[PDB]
Short mmCIF file of all heavy atoms in Angstrom, two decimals:
data_model
loop_
_atom_site.label_atom_id
_atom_site.label_comp_id
_atom_site.label_asym_id
_atom_site.label_seq_id
_atom_site.Cartn_x
_atom_site.Cartn_y
_atom_site.Cartn_z
N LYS A 66 -11.36 22.23 5.03
CA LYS A 66 -12.78 22.34 4.59
C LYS A 66 -13.62 21.38 5.37
O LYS A 66 -14.80 21.68 5.70
CB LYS A 66 -12.94 22.15 3.07
CG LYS A 66 -12.35 23.30 2.25
CD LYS A 66 -12.84 23.27 0.78
CE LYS A 66 -12.38 24.53 0.04
NZ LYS A 66 -12.89 24.55 -1.38
N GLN B 11 -24.41 32.48 1.80
CA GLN B 11 -23.13 32.04 2.23
C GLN B 11 -21.97 32.61 1.34
O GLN B 11 -20.87 32.77 1.81
CB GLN B 11 -22.97 30.50 2.15
CG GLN B 11 -23.87 29.84 3.21
CD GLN B 11 -23.62 28.34 3.32
OE1 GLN B 11 -23.64 27.75 4.40
NE2 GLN B 11 -23.41 27.68 2.17
N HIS B 12 -22.26 32.92 0.06
CA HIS B 12 -21.14 33.18 -0.85
C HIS B 12 -21.16 34.47 -1.62
O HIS B 12 -20.21 34.77 -2.30
CB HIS B 12 -21.05 32.02 -1.84
CG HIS B 12 -20.77 30.73 -1.20
ND1 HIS B 12 -19.62 30.52 -0.44
CD2 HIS B 12 -21.49 29.58 -1.07
CE1 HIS B 12 -19.70 29.24 0.03
NE2 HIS B 12 -20.82 28.72 -0.30
N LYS B 41 -18.44 27.79 11.15
CA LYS B 41 -18.27 27.15 9.86
C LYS B 41 -16.74 27.29 9.53
O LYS B 41 -16.19 28.36 9.63
CB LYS B 41 -19.05 27.83 8.73
CG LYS B 41 -19.02 27.11 7.36
CD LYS B 41 -19.87 27.85 6.32
CE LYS B 41 -19.98 27.08 5.07
NZ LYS B 41 -19.02 27.42 4.01
N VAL B 43 -14.65 26.87 6.90
CA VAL B 43 -14.15 27.50 5.66
C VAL B 43 -15.29 28.06 4.84
O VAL B 43 -16.33 27.42 4.71
CB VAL B 43 -13.42 26.50 4.76
CG1 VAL B 43 -12.91 27.07 3.43
CG2 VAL B 43 -12.23 25.86 5.48
N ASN B 44 -15.12 29.26 4.27
CA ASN B 44 -16.20 29.83 3.49
C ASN B 44 -15.65 30.95 2.58
O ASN B 44 -14.92 31.83 3.06
CB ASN B 44 -17.26 30.45 4.41
CG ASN B 44 -18.49 30.83 3.58
OD1 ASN B 44 -19.32 30.01 3.15
ND2 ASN B 44 -18.71 32.15 3.42
N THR B 45 -16.00 30.96 1.33
CA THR B 45 -15.58 31.98 0.35
C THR B 45 -16.70 32.97 -0.03
O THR B 45 -17.80 32.52 -0.30
CB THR B 45 -15.05 31.28 -0.91
OG1 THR B 45 -14.08 30.32 -0.63
CG2 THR B 45 -14.52 32.28 -1.93
N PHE B 46 -16.39 34.24 0.00
CA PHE B 46 -17.34 35.25 -0.50
C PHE B 46 -16.80 35.80 -1.79
O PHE B 46 -15.63 36.00 -2.00
CB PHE B 46 -17.44 36.41 0.53
CG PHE B 46 -18.11 36.01 1.80
CD1 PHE B 46 -17.35 35.67 2.94
CD2 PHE B 46 -19.49 35.98 1.95
CE1 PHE B 46 -17.98 35.36 4.11
CE2 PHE B 46 -20.07 35.60 3.13
CZ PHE B 46 -19.35 35.31 4.18
N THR B 82 -12.95 36.58 -1.31
CA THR B 82 -12.24 36.51 -0.02
C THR B 82 -12.51 35.13 0.57
O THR B 82 -13.69 34.71 0.72
CB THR B 82 -12.81 37.54 0.96
OG1 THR B 82 -12.61 38.87 0.41
CG2 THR B 82 -12.04 37.48 2.26
N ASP B 83 -11.44 34.41 0.91
CA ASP B 83 -11.54 33.13 1.59
C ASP B 83 -11.46 33.42 3.09
O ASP B 83 -10.58 34.19 3.55
CB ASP B 83 -10.42 32.15 1.17
CG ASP B 83 -10.82 30.68 1.53
OD1 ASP B 83 -12.04 30.34 1.53
OD2 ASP B 83 -9.92 29.87 1.80
N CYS B 84 -12.38 32.79 3.83
CA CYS B 84 -12.41 32.90 5.32
C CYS B 84 -12.19 31.52 5.86
O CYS B 84 -12.88 30.57 5.55
CB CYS B 84 -13.81 33.42 5.75
SG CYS B 84 -14.21 35.05 5.15
N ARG B 85 -11.15 31.40 6.70
CA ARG B 85 -10.90 30.09 7.36
C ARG B 85 -10.58 30.28 8.83
O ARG B 85 -9.86 31.23 9.22
CB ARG B 85 -9.67 29.43 6.69
CG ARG B 85 -10.02 28.88 5.32
CD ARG B 85 -8.89 28.02 4.72
NE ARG B 85 -9.30 27.42 3.50
CZ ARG B 85 -9.37 26.16 3.20
NH1 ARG B 85 -8.95 25.22 4.13
NH2 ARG B 85 -9.74 25.75 2.01
N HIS B 119 -23.80 25.50 -5.05
CA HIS B 119 -22.64 25.18 -4.21
C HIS B 119 -21.40 25.92 -4.72
O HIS B 119 -21.30 26.12 -5.92
CB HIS B 119 -22.32 23.72 -4.18
CG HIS B 119 -23.37 22.81 -3.60
ND1 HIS B 119 -24.01 21.85 -4.34
CD2 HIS B 119 -23.95 22.82 -2.40
CE1 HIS B 119 -24.87 21.23 -3.60
NE2 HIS B 119 -24.88 21.80 -2.39
N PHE B 120 -20.55 26.31 -3.84
CA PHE B 120 -19.25 26.86 -4.24
C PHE B 120 -18.24 25.72 -4.11
O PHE B 120 -17.97 25.22 -2.97
CB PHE B 120 -18.85 27.99 -3.28
CG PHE B 120 -17.65 28.77 -3.72
CD1 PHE B 120 -17.82 29.86 -4.63
CD2 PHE B 120 -16.35 28.40 -3.37
CE1 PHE B 120 -16.75 30.57 -5.07
CE2 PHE B 120 -15.26 29.09 -3.86
CZ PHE B 120 -15.47 30.22 -4.68
N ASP B 121 -17.68 25.32 -5.24
CA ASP B 121 -16.81 24.15 -5.23
C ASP B 121 -15.34 24.46 -4.91
O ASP B 121 -14.71 23.77 -4.10
CB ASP B 121 -16.84 23.42 -6.58
CG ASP B 121 -16.40 21.96 -6.47
OD1 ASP B 121 -16.90 21.24 -5.54
OD2 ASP B 121 -15.57 21.56 -7.31
N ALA B 122 -14.84 25.53 -5.53
CA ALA B 122 -13.42 25.89 -5.38
C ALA B 122 -13.15 27.17 -6.13
O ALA B 122 -13.96 27.64 -6.89
CB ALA B 122 -12.56 24.74 -5.97
CL1 LIG C 202 -16.51 27.86 0.48
#
Side-chain angles (χ1 to χ4, degrees):
Chain A
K66 289 195 176 183
Chain B
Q11 293 189 142
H12 301 297
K41 187 178 189 266
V43 176
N44 190 73
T45 304
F46 293 99
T82 302
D83 200 32
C84 299
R85 288 188 176 237
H119 297 121
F120 191 88
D121 201 49

